[PDB]
Amino acid sequence: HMVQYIIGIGTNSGFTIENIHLAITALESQQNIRIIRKASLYSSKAVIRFLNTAVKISSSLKPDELLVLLKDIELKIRVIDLDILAAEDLILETDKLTIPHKELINRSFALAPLLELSKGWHHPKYVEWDLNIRLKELGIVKLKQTLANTIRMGIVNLSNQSSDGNFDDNQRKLNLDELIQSGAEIIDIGAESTKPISIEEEFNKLNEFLEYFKSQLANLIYKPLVSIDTRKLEVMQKILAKHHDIIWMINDVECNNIEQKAQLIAKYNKKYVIIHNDNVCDYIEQKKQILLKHGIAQQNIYFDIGFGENIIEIKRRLELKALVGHSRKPSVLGLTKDSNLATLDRATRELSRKLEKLDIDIIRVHKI
Ligand SMILES: [Mg+2]
């Protein structure tokens, strides 16, 4: 027979959302588990901030078996916490486990996603306790970051197409805040624009911002994955040296020095984006084989059309996850090129909402 379980999932170290998807993927991988539904992402304060959700699963696993599975997944992914919140109306009391979880009614970050998945759930020991009133008595933020297949990469530009006052240079910080409130799961930080800048200057812009990011780590309701945008082998080297621990991906619009780049990225176990800078398949295909040739796993490679109607065809040919950067590009948005940042951002949300349905792995945007 099948039993419906709610699994609570929390994390507050490393790449938080990645840890959550990895735990879910691990569950889904079991031949005796089916994933019915995922809850939203919730952020709570560390007694840096926790990221919590819950998933509802169907399984023939007995509770104790299911607990064994959770412990192993925890050991594989300790930077993640997996708990059996509930099994419908089941009541199990033992030293090994109690269902519902002892602390469920004392943790808004547990009860909140649980009631989201099962709005009608009542605690089987307290069938008269209206858990919504209980939830309110407790002490929580429901993020706009989601567990969706398409993740949003928010653009944080450190260059000069973007404005200091006499005693205020807060613009880039405010915009990090904006992106995080609005659901960006990933931020892409770039220090160049669209006159060259030196290695040392590009590095300094990036580093000042990552050092700022780190100082805010516990102030962030959500710690996004970090992508660095640079075409320079040397800034990559410097930035990974100091900050690899918060960097998830490298976004590189320059095939110059690929071999050395691939060795670095391989060594640091980070994601790489191939950018185009039809036949386009083969361009990406060639670069693609070099990277593999230098030691980086194929799963870690994304491709990008590089605009500067049939992407799904291309991805499927390519064997690689799609990253799409359509934000504020008047051509692909089919707008006049004079249109204001207000109308550009509008058309782009409209199109973002469209690419989200096709399961584009990453969309890169200025605004959510
Ligand atoms: Mg635990």
Author numbering: 0 to 46, 57 to 86, 98 to 159, 161 to 183, 185 to 216, 221 to 303, 320 to 350, 363 to 422
Sentences from the paper on this structure:
Here, we report the structure of the F. tularensis enzyme and show that it is fused to 6-hydroxymethyl-7,8-dihydropterin pyrophosphokinase (FtHPPK) which catalyzes the previous step in the pathway. DHPS acts at a crucial convergence point in the folate pathway, and catalyzes the condensation of p-aminobenzoic acid (pABA) and 6-hydroxymethyl-7,8–dihydropterin-pyrophosphate (DHPPP) to form the intermediate dihydropteroate. The N-terminal FtHPPK module is connected to the C-terminal FtDHPS module by a structured linker region, and the structures of each module are very similar to those of the monofunctional enzymes. The structure reveals the molecular organization of the resulting bifunctional enzyme, and we also demonstrate that each active site binds substrate in the same manner observed in the monofunctional forms.
The two molecules in the asymmetric unit are very similar (RMSD of 0.4 Å on α-carbons) and differ only in the flexible loop regions. Regions missing in the final model due to disorder are residues 44–56 and 89–98 within the FtHPPK module, and residues 213–224, 304–318 and 354 within the FtDHPS. In addition, there was no observable electron density for the N-terminal 20 residues that correspond to the His6-tag. In one of the molecules of the asymmetric unit in the apo structure, one Mg2+ ion remains coordinated between the side chains of Asp101 and Asp103 in the absence of substrate, but the relatively high B factors of the ion and its coordinating oxygen atoms suggest that it is weakly bound. However, as anticipated from the sequence alignment, only seven of the eight surrounding α-helices are present (Dα1-Dα2-Dα3-Dα4-Dα5-Dα6-Dα7) with the carboxy-terminal Dα8 helix missing. The gap in the TIM barrel is partly filled by Lys421 and Ile422 that follow Dβ8 at the C-terminus, and by the flanking helices Dα1 and Dα7 that move slightly inwards to fill the space, but there remains a significant cleft on the surface of the TIM-barrel structure. In the E. coli and B. anthracis DHPS structures, there is an N-terminal β-hairpin that caps the N-terminal end of the TIM-barrel, but this is not present in the F. tularensis structure. The FtHPPK domain partially performs this role, but is shifted by approximately 30° from where the β-hairpin would typically be positioned. In both molecules in the asymmetric unit, D1 (residues 180 to 193) is folded into an extended β-ribbon and makes a crystal contact with a neighboring molecule via Phe189.
